[PDB]
Structures are given as structure tokens and as C-alpha cells.
Design a protein around this motif. Structure first.
Motif, PDB file in Angstrom:
ATOM      1  N   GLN A   1     -12.504 -14.306  32.659  1.00  0.00           N
ATOM      2  CA  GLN A   1     -12.500 -12.848  32.610  1.00  0.00           C
ATOM      3  C   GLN A   1     -11.757 -12.359  31.368  1.00  0.00           C
ATOM      4  N   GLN A   2     -10.567 -11.783  31.519  1.00  0.00           N
ATOM      5  CA  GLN A   2      -9.857 -11.251  30.359  1.00  0.00           C
ATOM      6  C   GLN A   2      -9.184 -12.368  29.564  1.00  0.00           C
TER       7      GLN A   2
ATOM      8  N   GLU B   1      -7.780 -15.285  32.117  1.00  0.00           N
ATOM      9  CA  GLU B   1      -7.957 -15.182  33.562  1.00  0.00           C
ATOM     10  C   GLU B   1      -9.127 -16.040  34.036  1.00  0.00           C
TER      11      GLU B   1
ATOM     12  N   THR C   1      -1.977 -12.375  37.356  1.00  0.00           N
ATOM     13  CA  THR C   1      -2.832 -12.687  38.490  1.00  0.00           C
ATOM     14  C   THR C   1      -2.714 -14.170  38.842  1.00  0.00           C
TER      15      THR C   1
ATOM     16  N   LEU D   1      -4.276 -16.455  36.240  1.00  0.00           N
ATOM     17  CA  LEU D   1      -3.862 -16.354  34.847  1.00  0.00           C
ATOM     18  C   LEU D   1      -3.360 -17.722  34.371  1.00  0.00           C
TER      19      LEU D   1
END
Ligand SMILES: *Cc1c(COP(=O)(O)O)cnc(C)c1O
Ligand SMILES: *Cc1c(COP(=O)(O)O)cnc(C)c1O
Ligand SMILES: *Cc1c(COP(=O)(O)O)cnc(C)c1O
Ligand SMILES: *Cc1c(COP(=O)(O)O)cnc(C)c1O
Ligand code: NA
Ligand code: NA
Ligand code: NA
Ligand code: NA
Ligand code: NA
Ligand code: NA
Ligand code: NA
Ligand code: NA
Lengths: 380, 380, 380, 380
Positions: free
Chosen positions: D271-272, D301, D353, D356
Motif C-alpha cells: 500500500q503506502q 505497508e 499499522t 508497516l
């Protein structure tokens, strides 16, 4: 002046530049030259010379009253360097019970290069005179020897070597320069496995060589620089550091040795004891005449292998390991650890019985060492 | 997988016990045994084996795609150990311009032990075939050589050595295992002065040997343990540490080497340039076929001695010192520093002119090294 | 059992993994984890814990009969860590002549953070009782002190500290754990500048802290890990190594101290002598009751500054340098080297006269040290 | 001239005395004085100054274009020394996501001494202006921060600090002096955990501080000498040695970082991605303006904890360990290893998160690192 002072102040072990009271560790291989051939302090390449190694070389030269010191990556590298003073066809006399590694080197390496080796019982020095050939160039003596601590007359060996034109060499490892100085008795070269007492702490493998002979020193320096078995700077530093307490350590060791021998001789489970301090020991008067203390290596007989192993397991302060000269007291069984390739019958004939124990006395409390070993013997 | 990854992850350089991500420094001479002969991890005496030295031995064995590594107290101790695989009467072929210390060792030490030496121009491998005698046992090759960077065909030398039953040896110091792997080309033994590129930081004197041959490894281990020229643990640790950046350092050095050679070839004050990357260099195609990069040693001719000294004084980033393979760029004049005992006329005949300069390229910025050397040449 | 044995065998100073008889040097910052949070031997980051540092921590905890050891980058870092057990508004009592660096730290650093400091003459322990405020949390004692060797009753200080809820701390540097064990007398925390006797060789700067109190140990560990004044692994190794000979060194030092004091008291050029072994010394019976030997620091008065400097120049075996506890005997002049910022009149009032000499006795031969110092005094 | 040259030749890292091309290791605590107060080269006691530590201090001062360097036993000891420039009642502003150890030190140690702490989001510098109180004395900035790599404008922070009379401090660990020089932008003090990139080899714990301000340097020197968190000589030597390859290592790391980020942004299981090189990253233009390369720390992530652990197990070349800046690539999960005491809901709110992942890119081959991580992500 006195020996304990000489250990602290003899040799060059400070920094002239900063005043540092310990020798700097020159972890370096090469050196700036201001102009081609112009060296600031005489250093140009660490294999040829390194200032930390020079510090330890000056300590060993001072302690043995020599003029030149040499530091090698191990005791056997020192011995190999000295043996490479000879050529093919040359012949060397050694005492018959020389250290196993020296034996191995001479009879498995240097004989392939045409060096001829004769082992003789040097406890009678006329043995040497009988063994001298026209090709003999070197006389190599350990005294006292391992593991039965046979003593050889150093000053008579030096005289024989001078008379017949031989390079004389003494492996002075067991006594250290604190108690025995072969160069003062006419020997040409003295050497040490500094892995043992000189380092003193079981943490450096190193050899040291000293001489007063300019031309032998030149030849040794050439061999060192061409075959390259040099001690590194960190190990040189740890050697210099360990040597500071040599006097204190050897005197503690000698106090314990005397008491341990009284105990061993009184104990019912112990037969023969080997140590040059015993008055009935061969050449005891010779040892007293050439040394003023004692090695910390003692050998003694128990009944058999099982007794020897039980002894090792019952002691609290005697550690099972190789080497000698530690701060810890060490114990071993030669017939199983250093002489196990010899056939059993020849072992028994040479005195290496199955219950021969060798201890290297450390610097623990004398009463603890005597009591621990006695209570272990009591379990036999 | 790829070479830069292999430098980081090849070999055993972590601690299995604690998980430490670097090799512990076992500053120790001996090891506890739980029972007589029972070793916890196989160690019993550091001259025989030490876990820090084993770590660096496993790195060199991995990087050269061998199976056995050996770490010695210097490059010439590695060479001496390898030469002691021979006996009196055996004969060894070396390239004619082998390193001065190797020359010295063979012709001033090992010839006194009956080793016979022949120097031949191995840039034509049939030279080797002509020099082979019935007593020849070893072929010893440096490629590229010092200071004129002569290239020898490694794979043909390996084939010749196999055909005639010879132990083949390559001194791979100048190329490092990052660019050239003699064991992959059939050579029996590869060795290095790790004092140079492998350590990389001018702070360790050390030699390294790798082989894939079990029986040669056994003989080398026996020689190492009996003549004792072992690398110490601190120097082994610094070697392992320096090797991590070998790939990065060699690639930087190669970038600067290419640019410096373009500059040298264009400059009016520079005559001949010696380096295997020049397409007109003898055996350039052979080098390209057996290596995939270049050494950082370059030699080139200026007019005379005075020009060479002016060059040294005018450079800001080229340091006057011995050795090579540093992070600093080094400069020297062979005719004055390594060949000054050769008569001048023979020096000139072999190519060692009075204005022959040798530089060892370091890892400074490429443009700074090119500009500094060019502006120094401009002052001639 | 006995102290000299405990120095060799107390603590964990071998390698469980390989059996190495000395502590490996873990020159490493971090550690492999097999799974997240799963540590092989409990190590994860060297600032938090390092196995070489743990070895020296276990030695100091054992030698002081504590349960927890802590190794800091210097003696004053140990003291700072202990002082950071307090908060702003808390008050600490120290003896009036505490070490200059401790004074500096408390009155120039920690007072800016609201720690309040009172210096009292603790040679009478009721002084402590008078100085106790409602905000007092710590009692910090050096005994004997520098340079006049004032003695403080440790066991009564411990009782006072328990009665009033204070953390008691003893700086045990001068006596070492070989002769004085404050934790056995009820003290909460004992600390050392291991830079002096414990290292013993003038080559490590280090501090050591021991306690038996689980919760104080937890707080010290938190402070160590958050302010980060940790001893490095090489210095930890050299500390462990130096401690092995502590007993031998302290006993040699004590023999020389006794003889040197007889000489100093008999000499016409010497006025007062300060040392706890002198029967007329304040609290001599207290010292004899809490220690079973003596520090090697002696102070004595000559006429004036010029006599003190002449003394320094005339001695052969007393070296002019800072620190104490070396293998070399050291000499200094407090009024010029440690108290020179105090006005002369206050210096004279506190006993720091211009001819006050302090010697730190080393391990040279007793007769050489006595004779050298006496012949130097004779030149006055 | 250029940066790679400055790394080799900047600072004093040779021996003036012998010409040794590397810094000698002064394993020493004290120094001979020729006369009282007369120091040969300015050294008198190693806690105050040691020549090996001075060498590394001069390197960090040169690389950061400062005038004074300071070497501490760890990064947090450097931070503690800097924080002790303040008194009780003083107030310091830090960025909200400062390193966990810095947070711990300020809020669990120095608040007990009356230092007041405010954490603000410095990515908008007017936040700083709002937080300034009449008692604020220090502004302490990390950029980029851990683990989300938030960027703070250094030059505007320096201007704000000058305007309001504040000591400005930048923790420059992640960027190193090779890419970012806060003192050139008006900052008063720059510091580093040299445990990470500067040492570069995971084998030294150390902190480094540089400044150009004479009076701040005087105060730092006083604090260093009184609280004693000094780096030892062996660790100083290994730091100097590691810094030589900093440029080469950082450039390799940056090549791999660029390629790894392209891969991460293209992958479906990711994701990020957090890294200042991404153009959509907050203050990307600010970073480009104050630095000319990138840190090797990347965060990204994945789905959840189980995916993160599977990632760790599937990679061959990413090692699970703490710290960063090694030659090995390292991987970790902040929510489990550095932020696990934060409640899960606050963790999620701050961006930490459960999936992460943080990687620290090493110097392995770029293609191996990209391929290994991609094939591990493919198993999700
Ligand atoms: C005491 C001392 C000597 C004495 O040498 P000997 O020949 O054994 O009397 C030599 N050098 C130094 C430095 C000494 O301190
Ligand atoms: C990449 C790698 C190899 C590859 O070896 P080659 O024969 O050169 O392909 C070997 N070992 C390790 C540990 C590696 O990382
Ligand atoms: C002798 C010894 C002791 C004795 O401790 P004390 O409380 O002083 O009697 C403790 N530990 C070891 C390892 C010892 O050898
Ligand atoms: C190149 C170089 C510099 C240049 O410094 P800058 O301010 O970055 O330009 C400084 N010192 C040395 C020794 C150098 O080699
Ligand atoms: Na040798
Ligand atoms: Na003689
Ligand atoms: Na050898
Ligand atoms: Na083969
Ligand atoms: Na501290
Ligand atoms: Na108690
Ligand atoms: Na500090
Ligand atoms: Na400024």
C-alpha cells in the motif's frame, strides 16, 4: 635494578611522541615517507618493522640481557625461523624429549629440506660430544623439558657449542627470563613460546627470540622479513601488557608449586613426582646453579587412566585444557593428549605411563590448590 | 547470487551462539574440554585453529569458489607455506618478474634447502613447457605482475600443469577474487597478500590461501600448524571487516583507473603507460578473457628521476608510501624503492627506467585524482 | 574459596559455545533474531547489553558479593549514573574531601538540575546525622579519600542510611574489592573507577557499579540504557584481563607501602605522613575493622614546592603522571596538579601544603622503591 | 575537494611521529609529563582527551564543516550531553516523532531534573513558533525521522532558532554528512549515532557531535569531561576506519533505494510507501533543497502482521535485527519492535499499522535486493 623493577621499566614501552605510558597499538601496514628513502622514525612497511612489535622485541631483549629481539606469530614460528639459519646437509642436535611440535617440525618438515636431526639425552652433556658430526651446526636444548622435566646443563652446552663451532639455542619457555637467562651463560640464541608464561593470560599465541650476536640477529631479521611469520600489533601489545606481572605471577606459582609437591610426595595414591626442585631429581644441583626459581609444570604418577580421569573430574580448580602458563591451573594426561600416537609399550618405556598427570600451576590461592588436589586424590 | 551480495553474505561471519551479526574476536589461546578429546565446537589450541581465523578462512574459500581457506601472518608467509609443499631436489617455475619478496624468498631462503628455481617469461606459455624438467613439481604465476603489469594466461597454465603433474599456484593479489578466480580455471592453489586490496585500509598485514583440493589442503594445514605463521584473531577480524566493501572499493578504483589512463595517454610529459586495459598491451585479450575488471596499479614513464620526484611533490592526493591497495592513492618510483639493488643498465633493459612511476589508485573522487595528477604532470 | 582463587574463577569469563578460556570480544552492535522478539541468548542491541560487557559486570558483582554489575565508559560516568537516581529537589550528603571530579560533577552539573549538595566531614558519622534534611535521599562516601586518606566508618554510615531511608553509596576505588567490600557492610551501591587498580595497567578508562538491590539495579539499568555511558567491548575485555592479577598486584603494593612508610617516618626531610596504616591516623581502628589491607596511595609533606619538584626529578622509578593504581609507581604534587584553583590560604588550611607529595605505589621491587625515594629525599 | 576525496584526506588520521598512514590506537589512560603542567602534545588523562578519539573528533568536525568534534560512548550519550547544556526550568522543542530513545531520555530522565519537553509537528515550521515559550532554550530536530521519514525544513528551523535565541540541534544520523550538512544551514549543533551509517559495519556503538560555536564547544567539553560518556580508543579507531568508505556505501545504498522504491510502488501487495524521494511525500522539495541524496531507510505497508512476518521469513538477503546502516540489509516491524508499548489504536492513528515494515538498505547487489524483496512480496 632488581628483577621486578626491570619488568616494569626495562625496554621501550611508552610513547615518545605523546607521553602515553603504554605502547600505542600501530594497527597499520605502511608509513608516509617525507622523501624517497627518508623515513621519519625508521619505519616503512609493517612486515619489516612495526613500532608495537619493536616495543615487545625490546622488552624480550632487555629481560634476557640480549641486544636483539624478534617477535613471531607463534613459538613454532620462532623455532622454524631459527632452524632456517641452517642449509641442506647441516645437522642439528636436540634433546631427546624436546617439545612435540619441535619434533614434528624438524622430522616432518625440515628433514624434507635436507636438515639432519639427532635426538640425544643431553642430561649427560658428553652425549652431545659423541653426537657431533663434521656437518653439525646447531645445538638446541630445552631445559627443563616436557612432561618429565629433565634438566640439561646450559653452561656446559654453551662451552661445547663454542668449542665445536655450533650455534647454541635454548628454548627457555618453562623457566621464563624471570628465573633463567641462557644468554648470560654463553648461549647464542634464546627463544620462548610467549603463548605460555610471558603472555600469562591464555590469550596470545606468540613466539619470542633474543640474541646478543649481531650477525645472527642480521640473519634472523632477514629470515623474518622473507618468510613473514611476524607477530601482529594487537598481540604484541597484549604480550607487553602480560609481561608486566610476570614476576608476581611466577612467584605466586612457585609458592604453590612447593606446597603442592610436599602434598604429592606425602599422598598414598601418588607414585613418582617429576620436578627439578626435588633433591633426588636428576641434575637438581645443575638446575639450582643455572636458575633461581622453578617452572610451574609438575608431573606425577597415579595408578592408571581411570584414576587420572577421576582426578580431573574431582578437582574444582584444575581446568582440562591444552597449553600451560595460564592464570588458571591446568591439568592434562600426556599419554592421551600429547603422546597418544606413540605405541603404548614405548610410552611406558619412556616414562609416559597411563596414569601420568601433568599440572600447570596457576595463581589461585596456594591452600585452595593444595586442598583441592589432595581431596581429589583422596577419592582414589 | 551476484558478487556484491556474495561479499556480504558468503562465508560464516556471524555468531551462532549469541546471534551477533559480526564475527567475535576470540583473543584466546586454548579451550575447555568437557572430557579428554571431547571438543565443544572442534577447537583445542589457537595455533591449530581459532574461530575468528576460521571465519576469515571461510570467506576467502567462498570468494574464490574453493573449499579450504588458510590465513597467514603475511603474504610472504602464505607463499612460504605453499613452497614448503616441495622437498629438496624439487624444481619450481615462476614468472620472471615475480614480486621482489617472492624472488627473495625463493632464491635466498629456499635454495639453501635444495629447492631449484627457474624464472621464465610466462606471457608465452610455451616458455613454461620448455622449462619443465623431470624434477619440476610447481608452477607459480602472478598475473598481472609488478610493476609492468605483464599478463599470463591462467587457463593454459592450468592445463600445462595438469598435463605434466604440477601443482599450479596463482598469486591473485592485484586482481582480488572480485575480478579473477583462478580456481575456476583449473588452478590448484590461489593466494593473496591480504595486506593490499582485501584488507583495503592499510592496517593489516596478512596472507590468504584457498584451494579445492582436499589433499593439498591437508598438507597446507599440517605445514601451517608446524611452522606456525598464523594470522592473529584481531587481524582476522579486521580482514573480514575490510572485505565487506571490496566490491564497492574495486569498482570505484576501476572508474578512476579508466579516466586516469585516458589522461596519461593524452599527456605530453608521459611516454609509455603499462596497464592490461590498454588494447595494445601484450595479452590484453587474455586478461579480458580471464578477468572482468582491472587492478588499480598503473605504471607510466616520465623523463627521468627528477621529473618523477617533482611529480611526487606536486600531487596533493597521491601519497608517497610503500604497499598498494589502500583507500588512499599511493605513488612510488620502482627504480629507487624496489629495484635499486639492480644495476642501472639491467634496470633500463628490463623496462625499469629512472622515470618509471607506479601509482596505486585509491577511492578518492575520480575527477580529483585525474585533475591532481594532470596538473602535477603539467609542471614538467 | 579464598580471594586469589575467586579472582580467577569468579564470574563468567569463558565462552560456553567454543570453550574458549577467555571472554570473546563481541565487537558488534546488533544481533540476529530468529523470530520477532526471540533472542538466542538474550542479546538484541549492544547499548542495552553486550556479552563482553556482561562478563565484566558479572566479575564486579561477584568480587563485591553483589548481584548486579554495571560497566560504564569511565568512573565519573558511573558516578553520574548513580546520581541520576535522584530528582530535582533531592539532597545528597558527600564527604567534604571527595574526589575533585565528583565535586565538579555535583556542584557544576547536577546542581543546575536541582540536586542539592552538602559536603560534611564524615570521619565523625554524627556529622551525617546533623546534615540530614527532609529532602535528603543519598549518602555518598569515599573511604579512604584523596589526597589525605581520611577514613569514614562504612558500617555506621550504612546504619544511618537505613534508619533515615537513604540510598548509601561507597566509592571503593582506593581499596578495591580485594580489601574492602561495602555491600557486605549494608551499603546499597558500591562503585569504582576501574581506570585505576582494577584495570591495573594504565590502559583502560572505565567505571564499575555493583549492587544487591533488585530495584536499584532496575533503575540503574534504565539510566544506563537511556543516557548511554556504556563501556565498550575491547575495554571490558582488558578490564576482565587486568582483574586476574589484582590480588597479586595489591599484595605487592602493600608490601612496598609498609616499607616505604617506615622509611618516610624515619627521614629528616619528611614531616607528616598520611596513610590509614599509621596507628596515629584518625579512624585507624575503623579502617582495620572494615578492610584487611591498604591502598597504595600515600601522601607526605616535604618543605616546599622546590623540594617537591627536586624529589620528582631525583627519583628514577617514580613517574610524573596523573591517575593512580598503575603497575608503575606514580608521583604528583596536589597543590599544583589537582588543587591549583583553590586559593593558597585555603589550600594550606585544608592540609594541601605546597610540599605535599602524593605517590601511588606500583609493583616494582620493594627495595628499589624504598631506596630510590630515600636517596631522592637525601638530596634535600 | 570533492566529497569522496574529503572522506579520505579530511581530518587528522595519520601519525605525525612515525608516519603511520592510519591512526594509532592509544590504549592508554595517562601520559608522562616532562615537568609539572608541561604536556608533550597536550595530553594528560584519556577521559579528558585521547589521541585516537581526537582523530575521530577531527574527522566529524571536518565532514560537517564545523570546528569542534566530540565522540561519545553512544548516540544517546551524545544526546544526553547536548541536553545537559540546559538547566532546570528550561524548555526544549522536539519533533513529535523523534527517535524512541531520545523520547525516553527526555521524558523519563531529564524531566525529573526539571527540563520541560514539548513535542510538535515540525513539518510545518510555524508549529515551532507557536510552541516557543519564554523559557524555551533549545530546538531539537531529526530529519528525516523514524519510521515514517517525515522531513523538517532545516534552514527555516535555524532562522527561527536564531530569532528567538535558541540553541538549534539536528540529529543527522539518517542522512550522514555525506548528503546533509546542518551546520552549513545555520544550525548550532549537529549530532549522529555513529552506531549506524558512519561506522557502517554493525560493530561500534558510538555518538558524534560537531559544532562551529566556540562557547558551545567549551560547554560540551566540560560536560563530556565531567559526566564521562567518552568513546574508547578502539571504537574510535574502528569509526575512523568505517568512515573511509561512507561515500561508496551511501551511493550503493542510494542506487538500491531508488530501484526498490520503483518495485514497491508497482507491487499489488504493498500500500503506502514512505521515503523523501517520492515526489508526493510531504516536504519532498524541502528535502531536495537541503540534502543531495537519500537515507537508506524505507517504510512501507503490507496488509497485516502475518503478511509482515511472512515477508521476513521469505527474504533471503534481508536480516531480522535491530539498528540500521549496516552493510547487510535489515528488516523490522515497528509495531512489534519499537512501538509495541503504544496502544494499538494510537499506533494506527499515528500511521504505525500492524503491517508497516521498515527496511534498512545495505550494500548487496541492487538486483538481488529488488528481486529478493519482490519474490517475497509475491508470496502474499
Ligand atoms: C634494574 C634494571 C636493569 C638491571 O639489569 P641487570 O643486568 O639484570 O642488572 C636493567 N635495565 C633496567 C631498565 C632496569 O630497571
Ligand atoms: C550469491 C552467492 C553465491 C553465488 O556463488 P557463485 O558460484 O559465484 O554463483 C554463493 N554463496 C553465497 C552466500 C551467495 O550469496
Ligand atoms: C572462592 C569463591 C567464592 C567465595 O565467595 P565468598 O563469599 O567470598 O566466600 C565465590 N565464588 C567463587 C567462584 C569462588 O571461587
Ligand atoms: C576537498 C577537501 C575539502 C573541501 O571542503 P568543502 O568545504 O566541502 O569544499 C576540505 N578539506 C579537505 C582535506 C579536502 O580534501
Ligand atoms: Na617463521
Ligand atoms: Na655470547
Ligand atoms: Na608460513
Ligand atoms: Na581443480
Ligand atoms: Na552515565
Ligand atoms: Na543490603
Ligand atoms: Na553523555
Ligand atoms: Na553558525
Amino acid at each position: 635494578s632488581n628483577k621486578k623493577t626491570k619488568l616494569i621499566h626495562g625496554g621501550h614501552t611508552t610513547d615518545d611522541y605523546t607521553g602515553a605510558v603504554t605502547t600505542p597499538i600501530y594497527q597499520t601496514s605502511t608509513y608516509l615517507q617525507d622523501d624517497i628513502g627518508d623515513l621519519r622514525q625508521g619505519y616503512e612497511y609493517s612486515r619489516t618493522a612495526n613500532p608495537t612489535r619493536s616495543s615487545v622485541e625490546s622488552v624480550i631483549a632487555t629481560l634476557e640481557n640480549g641486544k636483539h629481539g624478534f617477535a613471531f606469530s607463534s613459538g613454532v614460528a620462532a623455532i622454524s625461523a631459527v632452524v632456517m639459519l641452517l642449509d641442506k646437509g647441516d645437522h642439528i642436535i636436540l634433546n631427546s624429549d624436546v617439545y612435540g611440535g619441535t619434533n614434528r617440525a624438524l622430522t616432518k618438515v625440515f628433514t624434507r629440506f635436507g636438515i639432519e636431526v639427532d635426538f640425544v639425552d643431553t642430561t649427560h652433556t658428553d652425549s652431545i660430544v659423541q653426537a657431533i658430526r663434521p656437518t653439525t651446526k646447531m645445538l638446541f636444548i630445552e631445559t627443563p623439558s616436557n612432561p618429565l622435566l629433565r634438566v640439561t646443563d646450559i653452561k656446559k652446552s654453551a662451552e661445547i657449542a663454542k668449542e665445536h663451532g655450533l650455534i647454541s639455542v635454548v628454548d627457555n619457555t618453562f623457566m621464563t627470563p624471570y628465573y633463567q637467562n641462557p644468554l648470560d651463560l654463553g648461549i647464542d640464541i634464546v627463544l620462548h613460546s610467549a603463548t605460555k608464561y610471558l603472555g600469562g593470560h591464555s590469550d596470545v599465541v606468540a613466539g619470542l627470540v633474543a640474541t646478543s650476536d649481531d650477525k645472527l640477529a642480521e640473519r634472523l631479521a632477514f629470515i623474518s622479513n622473507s618468510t613473514g611469520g611476524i607477530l601482529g600489533p594487537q598481540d604484541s601489545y597484549l604480550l607487553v601488557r602480560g609481561i608486566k606481572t610476570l614476576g608476581l605471577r611466577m612467584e605466586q606459582i612457585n609458592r604453590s608449586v612447593i606446597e603442592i609437591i610436599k602434598m604429592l610426595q606425602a599422598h598414598p595414591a601418588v607414585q613418582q613426582v617429576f620436578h627439578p626442585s626435588i633433591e633426588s631429581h636428576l641434575n637438581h644441583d645443575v638446575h639450582m646453579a643455572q636458575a633461581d626459581g622453578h617452572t610451574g609444570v609438575i608431573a606425577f604418577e597415579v595408578k592408571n587412566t581411570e584414576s587420572a580421569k577421576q582426578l580431573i573430574k574431582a578437582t574444582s580448580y584444575y581446568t582440562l585444557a591444552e597449553s600451560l602458563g595460564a592464570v588458571e591451573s591446568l591439568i592434562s594426561v600426556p599419554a592421551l593428549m600429547t603422546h597418544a600416537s606413540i605405541p603404548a609399550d614405548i610410552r611406558a618405556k619412556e616414562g609416559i605411563t597411563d596414569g601420568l598427570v601433568r599440572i600447570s600451576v596457576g595463581i589461585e590461592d596456594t591452600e585452595d590448590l593444595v586442598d583441592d588436589l589432595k581431596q581429589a586424590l583422596d577419592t582414589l
